[PDB]
Design a protein around this nucleic acid. Sequence first.
RNA 1: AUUUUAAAAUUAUUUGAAUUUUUCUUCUUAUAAUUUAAGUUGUUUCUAUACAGUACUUUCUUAACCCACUCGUCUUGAAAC
RNA 2: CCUAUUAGCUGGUUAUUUUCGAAAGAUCUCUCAGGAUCGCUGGAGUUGAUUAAUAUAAUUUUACCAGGUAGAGAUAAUGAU
RNA 3: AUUUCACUCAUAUUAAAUAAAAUAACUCCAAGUGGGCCAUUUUUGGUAAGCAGAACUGGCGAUGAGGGAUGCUCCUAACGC
Lengths: 186, 180, 125, 66, 86, 223, 155
Amino acid sequence: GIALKNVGRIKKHGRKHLVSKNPYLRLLVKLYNFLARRTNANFNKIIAKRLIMPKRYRPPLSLSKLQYHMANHPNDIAVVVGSITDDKRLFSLKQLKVCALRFTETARKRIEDAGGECLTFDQLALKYPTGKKCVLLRGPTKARTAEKHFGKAPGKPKSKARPYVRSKGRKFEKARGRRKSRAYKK
Amino acid sequence: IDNSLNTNIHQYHIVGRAIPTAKDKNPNVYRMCIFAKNDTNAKSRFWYFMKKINKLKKSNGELLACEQIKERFPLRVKNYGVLLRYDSRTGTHNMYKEFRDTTKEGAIAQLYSEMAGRHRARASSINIIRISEISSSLVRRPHIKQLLKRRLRFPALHLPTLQKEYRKKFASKRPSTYRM
Amino acid sequence: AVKKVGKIIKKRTKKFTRFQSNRFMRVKPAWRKPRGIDCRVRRRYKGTNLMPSIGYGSNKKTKFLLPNNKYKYVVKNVKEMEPLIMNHTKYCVQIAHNVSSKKRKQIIERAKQMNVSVINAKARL
Amino acid sequence: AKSKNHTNHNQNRKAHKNGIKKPKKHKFMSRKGLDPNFFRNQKYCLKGIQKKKKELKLKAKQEKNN
Amino acid sequence: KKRLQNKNSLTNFAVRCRLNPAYKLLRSLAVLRMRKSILEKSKNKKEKRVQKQIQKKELQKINHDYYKGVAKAVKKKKKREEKKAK
Amino acid sequence: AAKKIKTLKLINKKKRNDLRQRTLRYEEEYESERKKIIELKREARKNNCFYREAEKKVVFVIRLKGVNKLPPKVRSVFRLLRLLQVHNGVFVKVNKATKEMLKIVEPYVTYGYPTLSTVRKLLYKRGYVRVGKVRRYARKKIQDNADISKHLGKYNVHGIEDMVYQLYTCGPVFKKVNNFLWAFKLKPPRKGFKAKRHAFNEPRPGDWGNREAHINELINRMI
Amino acid sequence: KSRGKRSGTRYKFSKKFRKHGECTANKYLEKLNYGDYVDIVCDSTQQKGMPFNYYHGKTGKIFHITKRGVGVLVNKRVKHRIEQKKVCVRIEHVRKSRCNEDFLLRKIKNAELIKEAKLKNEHINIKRKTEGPKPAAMIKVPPSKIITIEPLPFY
RNA sequence: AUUUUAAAAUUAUUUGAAUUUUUCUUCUUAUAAUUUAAGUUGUUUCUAUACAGUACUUUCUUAACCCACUCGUCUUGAAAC
RNA sequence: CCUAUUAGCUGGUUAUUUUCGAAAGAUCUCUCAGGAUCGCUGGAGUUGAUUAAUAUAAUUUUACCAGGUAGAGAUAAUGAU
RNA sequence: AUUUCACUCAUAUUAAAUAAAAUAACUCCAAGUGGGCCAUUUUUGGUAAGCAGAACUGGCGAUGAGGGAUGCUCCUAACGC
């Protein structure tokens, strides 16, 4: 008998292996955790970790945010483990060098016409194995709708959680507990 | 030396003093000799008595000396009178008891055994006050007085205590307790 | 107790039997973990049908090999003998039960010239 | 039948099983209902500071970009 | 690295000297000191003990004074009891 | 490219040499300490005065009870001084804070003053060390000075003799050496305990509490 | 069955012996700033702005100051977690906390020590000493000062 | 199959020094070997000069020492009269 | 036949190993053999740490707080006597 | 009060000690549970109860092992082979 937390076994949290049985993604994961193990690069370690993540944790990144993030350093390469989507609200692109897991057809065409080019992670490993002049970017992970229902329950004071309702008319969950006139409000 | 024969009571001389403060600069130094199994128990008893008689505790005090007193003549037989305070199941009593042996430690061990056997007084209930050698003239207990005759002799009616090797189970004939 | 021949040590023999299977005919001896509430075996009372554990696992260096110190491979015809040509001293061959005397002689002779030992060599003859 | 009305037994063990959580202690606290006529003035201070800083930076950018 | 037998770092001399570069010198010095003959101590025990006469005198006086203090305390408590008895 | 092994060998030689010198100076320091203590006590006897020596500043404490039926404060203190199993032993520097921590756990441990020979033999016979990167330690028996140098070398303490010195005397690098040292896992005493239930200072036989210098005889049969 | 605001405050909210009467005039001169620690002791003579029973004797840092009141942020243990609680009291029920004064004095003294130490290029230990075992001492005492102690008889 | 290496120790030569002064004194200078390093190796017999037995492996059946209360379930608590 | 009506109630609820592992408090309830909701638990995932630190701690030390239980009192108040 | 510039406040042991302190923090989904009982200490009602009702901690439940001859709760001590 010995007094240890968790009976003395270290507990880690999160993914350990990729769940996707995509052969190309499996090859990418093998290459990049080989790179992370062999090189010292935290860059490579982060890429290997992010290639493992669920879909909800590699959200799409718009061309607008891509340009905005790459505004100050124009000669470097934007590396994003998610996908790149075209933004119709953007008027003009400029000369973008971006490596990403997937490119939308529209985003791809816009980038090629702007004169930059789209890069895959095998090419990124070939050309920048350590990660010199590569800025690591990711899209908004907490922006998705499912997150709008999380946190404090809708009904707790000062809670911004969006409830689960059939629809949002006046007659759907808007009377008692959502206005002072009917009992309380929130 | 025979460890089975040897008890492990020893006499320890312990000197201690309260930690000097601003209120007093030179606290009086307290000195006492007590009997314990070892110097650690001796120091524990010394601090217990410091707390009980003086308002001085281990935390506010410091040791100055802790040595062991050894008998000058461990093979001379001498008579000891020991004053004693012990508490019973219903009260506290003082008694004076006499022994005779070579060392004060042996006398104290005898006293502990006698107290346990006669009054069921555990060692935790015993406080030794003033054990001292007494001359043959003023020995008081008859069981010690009768041991100081001018020529002492008696038979040896004790049963044999043989070695485990020769304490054999089956005997060829009945042994004699008569002996001699 | 443990059985040790050569380097192969079998940590326990006398396969575990189901609790109460000895005194109930409807209860087969095949081991089943008893859920119970006051179940004796589940509570691990001494002197009653100890349960299998992972601690009884044989070491992985000598796990699946037979007393002839090699792994068994069950074949159904001479075609499945080809991989044994490389590791004839690591694998012994056992002919499947539903193989006829036609094919058994062929497999026996092929294994003989392949220098690979056969477990049930003298079956159906 | 009669019900055990109440006990706090095992509640301390339950509480300490996931530890006694401490508040997160963020750096900034919302000023929604604290000292108006002071935090409004602070808003004005901050607006002026941004105005001056941004106009200096814009002057520098214009004189460096011609 | 593969685990080997943990050699006894106290009795295995090679591993002990590997762990403690000074141990072999210390042990050799101890052995040299042990290898001394007996005539020297036989003829010097009296020299070493006669110089301890003053030490014995000093250690006798402290114990003498301690017993004097104990006896004085005994006498004073007996006198107090005798005074209180009446 | 082969010069790297040569320079590695020469720096290892230099490390062995100054480790030897440091150990020799440690031995002189121990001997001088004993001599000065004896002579100073003699002088105190010669004069009509008292000499109180310093407290030993280091306590070896060994757990006595198991992992069941303990108050949460006791369990917390046991975790804090790394006494997790029934016969674990650790070194603790003695100050007011650790003394107060030990006070609340006193009925479940026994502790004392280790002395040089028992410190040395504890380190040599039961000395295990936390090797891996932080929080991934992987206990290993010493068997070599390589890992001691690797982790503790920056404090100029590469060597088991340096560890012994820093433990016996509450040296400037004591917390680091103690933390680097895995908790000692001791066998039961050769001749058994007296009574784990009762205090050492109780007149009846007992075991728990502060044994002072008497911890060494117990460690020797627990080792 | 009774859980009023002041339930169970018979002695906690009672004035001390011969210490009755309203707060001293000098207390209103006390200087309070944002973020500094403050003690919550309830003054029964002032009823408005009285803190709740629980917070009497607690400490917390000021997060709000009004014309005659202070909002102080206090940790409260609720079952399995501590949580922050904004308690609003009047001036009489709050007092400057000395929970920091040793730290402040240490900061000032240590700064004016570090300045001189760096000036003289010396290495000093600035951390607190947690004093433990005392060194060996060589003490002298008159023989007429040692007194013999032995346990007393019963009476 | 590029740490059972390196070193550490020991032996035999060898270089200088030190010191407790030397047949296990220590420290390096080089060389060559060993293991006390760097988790058991050797010798001799038997099995046996057999092709399945009286041996060896194994199943079963019996004993013997120690231990062992009907399971499932509701229950705080079941071997439960 | 509707109808396999309903049952907050009783009974049952079918392979192995491994890992983690409870509650019998609390709030509301035509509620007291029930439920919802906190708490305790598992799984999943991210952010972190992986730097013998920092975050952190059923621990202590130092500094500073709050108390009116044990004890004490009746000549200090009230109530007794 | 905020902002920007300065200078600089131990860190080489870490603004007290100790710490298999990141085995952390957070988020999501969800199970079971929501009849408890016992021991030490404290305590209310009761003449008292293996009684009724509470506080702390530890256990039994959910758990075997050695001991207490015997025993759900005692002592030791918690469990791979």
